[PDB]
Amino acid sequence: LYCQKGLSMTVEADPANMFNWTTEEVETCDKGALCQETILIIKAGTETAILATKGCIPEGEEAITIVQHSSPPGLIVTSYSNYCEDSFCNDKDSLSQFWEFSESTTLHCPTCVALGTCFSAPSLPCPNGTTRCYQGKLEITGGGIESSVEVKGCTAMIGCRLMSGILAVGPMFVREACPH
Ligand SMILES: *[C@@H]1O[C@H](CO)[C@@H](O)[C@H](O)[C@H]1NC(C)=O
Numbered sequence: 131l132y133c134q135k136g137l138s139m140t141v142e143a144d145p146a147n148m149f150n151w152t153t154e155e156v157e158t159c160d161k162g163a164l165c166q167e168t169i170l171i172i173k174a175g176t177e178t179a180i181l182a183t184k185g186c187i188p189e190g191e192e193a194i195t196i197v198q199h200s201s202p203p204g205l206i207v208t209s210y211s212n213y214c215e216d217s218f219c220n221d222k223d224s225l226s227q228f229w230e231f232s233e234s235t236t237l238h239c240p241t242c243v244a245l246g247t248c249f250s251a252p253s254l255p256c257p258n259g260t261t262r263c264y265q266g267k268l269e270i271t272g273g274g275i276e277s278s279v280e281v282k283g284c285t286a287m288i289g290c291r292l293m294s295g296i297l298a299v300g301p302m303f304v305r306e307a308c309p310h
Pocket residue numbers: 234235258259
């Protein structure tokens with residue numbers, strides 16, 4: 131078994147539906163391994179953090195798993211994970227299917243997303259249906275991803291639940307914590 135191999139952690143001012151999940155490299159799996167491609171997409175205002183991993187994983191169930199962790203209005207978090215058992219099967223290139231990333235009471239909320247800590251988080255007018263401000267940090271380990279992501283923005287979600295308690299995202303483990 132051979133798998134597309136690549137690792138990418140970026141914050142884009144450009145939409146997710148122009149991200150190219152290109153991988154040049156391939157790698158050889160131990161026997162009984164799977165191919166995985168896993169991506170976590172976090173949009174705050176006009177910026178999108180994209181944490182993406184492709185390679186062999188020694189064990190797992192063949193499955194495609196799409197999770198809409200947070201839906202509009204406001205902060206949007208989607209993950210896609212494909213665990214597949216044919217050589218080169220982890221070949222996804224486009225995120226165009228995730229149109230959540232293509233777009234009375236007004237909330238103004240500090241807005242940012244950053245690898246590490248946000249340089250700045252200006253308070254911006256929130257999309258209609260927002261009821262509160264979110265501030266959190268995601269500590270991510272697994273699949274060769276090691277990062278903290280700071281996230282502030284607009285939401286109608288209750289509590290510290292940007293990930294909706296779905297903390298396993300293919301081989302990544304995402305620990306979500308908020309200020310108080
Ligand atoms: C915003 O939300 C409310 C509640 O659904 C709606 O009635 C109101 O007209 C909306 N405001 C705008 C600017 O569309």
